[PDB]
Design a protein around this motif. Structure first.
Motif, PDB file in Angstrom:
ATOM      1  N   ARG A  78       9.123   0.372  -7.344  1.00 34.64           N
ATOM      2  CA  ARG A  78       8.902   1.656  -6.697  1.00 34.64           C
ATOM      3  C   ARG A  78       9.997   1.964  -5.688  1.00 34.64           C
ATOM      4  O   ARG A  78      10.411   3.118  -5.555  1.00 34.64           O
ATOM      5  CB  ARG A  78       7.526   1.694  -6.045  1.00 34.64           C
ATOM      6  CG  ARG A  78       6.412   1.814  -7.046  1.00 34.64           C
ATOM      7  CD  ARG A  78       5.165   2.350  -6.406  1.00 34.64           C
ATOM      8  NE  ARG A  78       3.975   2.008  -7.165  1.00 34.64           N
ATOM      9  CZ  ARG A  78       3.091   1.100  -6.780  1.00 34.64           C
ATOM     10  NH1 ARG A  78       3.274   0.446  -5.644  1.00 34.64           N
ATOM     11  NH2 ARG A  78       2.030   0.848  -7.525  1.00 34.64           N
ATOM     12  N   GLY A  82       0.775  -1.214   0.000  1.00 37.68           N
ATOM     13  CA  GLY A  82       0.000   0.000   0.000  1.00 37.68           C
ATOM     14  C   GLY A  82       0.813   1.274   0.000  1.00 37.68           C
ATOM     15  O   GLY A  82       0.286   2.320  -0.386  1.00 37.68           O
ATOM     16  N   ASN A 119       3.905   3.900  -1.230  1.00 38.30           N
ATOM     17  CA  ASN A 119       4.401   4.244  -2.555  1.00 38.30           C
ATOM     18  C   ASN A 119       5.814   3.739  -2.794  1.00 38.30           C
ATOM     19  O   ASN A 119       6.288   3.787  -3.928  1.00 38.30           O
ATOM     20  CB  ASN A 119       4.339   5.751  -2.785  1.00 38.30           C
ATOM     21  CG  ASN A 119       4.410   6.119  -4.259  1.00 38.30           C
ATOM     22  OD1 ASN A 119       5.366   6.739  -4.708  1.00 38.30           O
ATOM     23  ND2 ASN A 119       3.399   5.724  -5.018  1.00 38.30           N
ATOM     24  N   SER A 149       0.795  13.593  -9.957  1.00 38.92           N
ATOM     25  CA  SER A 149       0.178  12.740 -10.961  1.00 38.92           C
ATOM     26  C   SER A 149       0.527  11.276 -10.736  1.00 38.92           C
ATOM     27  O   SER A 149      -0.165  10.388 -11.238  1.00 38.92           O
ATOM     28  CB  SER A 149       0.599  13.195 -12.358  1.00 38.92           C
ATOM     29  OG  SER A 149       1.879  12.700 -12.703  1.00 38.92           O
ATOM     30  N   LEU A 150       1.595  11.004  -9.988  1.00 37.51           N
ATOM     31  CA  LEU A 150       2.002   9.627  -9.741  1.00 37.51           C
ATOM     32  C   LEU A 150       1.561   9.090  -8.391  1.00 37.51           C
ATOM     33  O   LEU A 150       1.683   7.886  -8.160  1.00 37.51           O
ATOM     34  CB  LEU A 150       3.515   9.494  -9.832  1.00 37.51           C
ATOM     35  CG  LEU A 150       4.146   9.698 -11.198  1.00 37.51           C
ATOM     36  CD1 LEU A 150       5.622   9.797 -11.002  1.00 37.51           C
ATOM     37  CD2 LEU A 150       3.797   8.551 -12.118  1.00 37.51           C
ATOM     38  N   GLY A 151       1.069   9.936  -7.498  1.00 36.94           N
ATOM     39  CA  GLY A 151       0.805   9.497  -6.150  1.00 36.94           C
ATOM     40  C   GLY A 151       2.014   9.452  -5.252  1.00 36.94           C
ATOM     41  O   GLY A 151       1.954   8.813  -4.198  1.00 36.94           O
ATOM     42  N   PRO A 194       4.125  10.748  -2.377  1.00 29.22           N
ATOM     43  CA  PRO A 194       3.931  11.698  -1.270  1.00 29.22           C
ATOM     44  C   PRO A 194       5.002  12.778  -1.285  1.00 29.22           C
ATOM     45  O   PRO A 194       6.195  12.486  -1.374  1.00 29.22           O
ATOM     46  CB  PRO A 194       4.028  10.814  -0.021  1.00 29.22           C
ATOM     47  CG  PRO A 194       4.689   9.572  -0.478  1.00 29.22           C
ATOM     48  CD  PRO A 194       4.276   9.370  -1.891  1.00 29.22           C
TER      49      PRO A 194
END
Lengths: 162, 54
Positions: free
Chosen positions: A78, A70, A72, A119-121, A123
């Motif tokens: 990632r 969950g 990022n 735009s990518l989420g 934080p």
């Protein structure tokens, strides 16, 4: 990009003025710090991987939710993108510290970065915390004066994101 | 031919028309609402997931 010398040159070019005493004083101020900046950049380059590892450890320790499912920073891709972003931040902070001017941070890093992260989420506050972690580790590594100098560009990055 | 044979006997059913089904239709709509809720719950569970974590 623009360094401190080109910054002064531009400020005098827009006015069509030859250098006065104050311009030469600013140029002397930049030339006087050149050896300190060069030693700092060399030290940072020698230990950049260590800085990134230590700062990422600090960031993920203070925010464990980032690397759990969950978060990022949860996938190998990632997590890799995050540590790669931190490596970029350290490198361009070194570029700006060597240039004595924050222009390159605007031109190649901050222009569009907040929009990209939105735009990518990604934080923003967590990225700012990671930048602060790099600030701390880098300062410990480079010593007092070079740390005060790299702090300017780390804070410029943080302010650009915040 | 003198046996009494009955040909056209009337039927059981009455001559009236079909009674209306409004109450039955209402109860069927209630069953439909109950059945729609159980699928809407799943799709709602889908709606409340985070934004960009694919």
């Amino acid at each position: 990009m623009q360094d401190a010398i080109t910054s002064v040159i531009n400020t005098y070019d827009v006015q069509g003025k030859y250098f006065d005493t104050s311009a030469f004083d600013k140029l002397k101020a930049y030339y006087a710090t050149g050896e300190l900046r060069v030693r700092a950049a060399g030290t940072i380059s020698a230990n950049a991987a260590t800085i990134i590892k230590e700062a990422s450890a600090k960031l993920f320790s203070n925010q464990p939710d980032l690397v759990r499912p969950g978060g990022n920073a949860y996938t190998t891709r990632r997590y890799a993108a995050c540590v790669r972003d931190m490596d970029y931040f350290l490198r361009y902070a070194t570029y700006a510290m060597l240039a004595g001017d924050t222009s390159i941070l605007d031109e190649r890093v901050l222009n569009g970065l907040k929009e990209t992260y939105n735009s990518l989420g990604v934080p923003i506050s967590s990225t700012v915390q990671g930048i602060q972690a790099m600030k701390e580790v880098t300062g410990s590594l480079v010593g007092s004066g070079a740390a005060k100098e790299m702090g300017v560009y780390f804070d410029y990055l943080s302010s650009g994101l915040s | 031919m003198q046996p009494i044979i009955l040909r056209t006997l009337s039927a059981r059913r009455p001559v009236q028309g079909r009674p209306n089904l409004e109450t039955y239709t209402s109860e069927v709509e209630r069953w439909k609402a109950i059945a729609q809720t159980q699928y809407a719950l799943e799709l709602a569970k889908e709606m409340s997931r985070p934004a960009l974590r694919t």
